[model samples]
Target chain A: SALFDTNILIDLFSGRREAKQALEAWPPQNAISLITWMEVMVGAKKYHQEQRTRMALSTFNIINISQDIAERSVALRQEYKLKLPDAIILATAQLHRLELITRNTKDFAGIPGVVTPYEI
Target chain B: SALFDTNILIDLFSGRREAKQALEAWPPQNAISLITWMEVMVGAKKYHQEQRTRMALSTFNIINISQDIAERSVALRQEYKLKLPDAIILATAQLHRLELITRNTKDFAGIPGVVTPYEI
Candidate 1:
């Protein structure tokens, strides 16, 4: 399965039927980076909201950063000035040799193995 | 062994006695990133210069960027806007958990495990 980028969650989190429908077209076994774990959860202010958000994110595999990933991220950090979180996410995807799924068309484009299904 | 940054070669290659003396203070067990290999060699245009450069580099380990290092470089590419070669060199050091030896007093100063002996 591919790696899910954090940006797409904006649509996925909404009640928009088309977003879910679009997500349905992809494999169910998609994974996410651990950096995305913290990114999305910050949207939760209330305890209940946090728990619900966590539950919502439970379906995907959130990959953790290891020693190798850390070093890799630092490597990426030097070249593009990719935001720390973005580095970790993309690092996870690249190291795992998985495709990155996202909605941001500009940034991840022209880089390796990325697929963005739709735009706002 | 620690990783050697390319900048220090300016002094080391200049026939400066003190620079060689300074390098002597550190353990001879050192390595250079593949990126550095190219970086330093670029200064050599003539065949003899290139040959001499290669010979000079012969004593240290020259690390290559394999799949992991490549992915790691990409990961770092997304953060800190590190120059490509710099990211590669630093990534090699960080992943290997080795100190980085350079003469640049400022840039790598606060970064983890860096040593700058002198600045001119």
Candidate 2:
């Protein structure tokens, strides 16, 4: 299983061929934080665009906030100083034991299990 | 009721006297998005601070995400390009029909019901 970051999808929507290939080739099982879910949907200009966004996003499991994930998110902010969305994304991945697949690897640099399977 | 932005609480936690007064004197009942709830806890340096953070936060109504809020959040991002946390906070306040109280007026400028009751 894997946790896909928001940028990977952003790049995918922006026509990054590598991003599309990476998402398709990542582990069969995948998840994304609800924060990621909303971040990508923000790009939609209207209902039709929103619908397109949903179709692409509907495939991944959306990890909503749990007390456990929230606590770990605070800890990430407290310890690692990760920003809100970043902390939530990382916390979801870390606690749920999902390998993180992201194009922006430096933000989670030095953290274990963060893999950049493709580049834009 | 009101939706208190995370920064207002941050200022309050940082010993901003006006922030404390602003929070105390806002509408009797208040609410905060879950994003705001997690942000203040990030500043906690240890267990004592974390506990104190909860004590202050536990009072306000914590608004978790619903389908309505999620949709509104995505719309805000589309129409306004508000960042993830900002979009979430604004969406929660707008849909719940709460006055937004915060010191950071510039970010939310022109939005209906946003009130900066106090200055730093």
Please give the fraction of native interface contacts (Cα pairs under 8 Å between A and B) kept by each candidate: 0.00, 0.61
Per residue, candidate 2 scores C-alpha lDDT tens digits across A14-99 of 88888878878876668998888877777655435778778878888888887688878887876665666788788899998888
Scoring model 2 with DockQ, what do you get?
Answer: 0.62
Q: What is the TM-score of chain B in candidate 1?
A: 0.83
**Residue B68, candidate 2: how far off, in angstroms?**
2.1
Q: What is the DockQ of each candidate?
A: 0.04, 0.62
List TM-score per model, in order: 0.48, 0.88
lDDT of each: 0.68, 0.80
True contacts kept of 1: 0.00
Q: Model 1 over residues B1-120: C-alpha lDDT tens digits?
A: 777787777567766675786668678877987556655654543233767877888788877655455445544534645655566677778788888888866556577788887665
Off by over 4 Å in 1: A46-48, B1-120
Question: Which candidate's DockQ is highest?
Answer: 2
Error of 2 at A82 (Å): 2.7
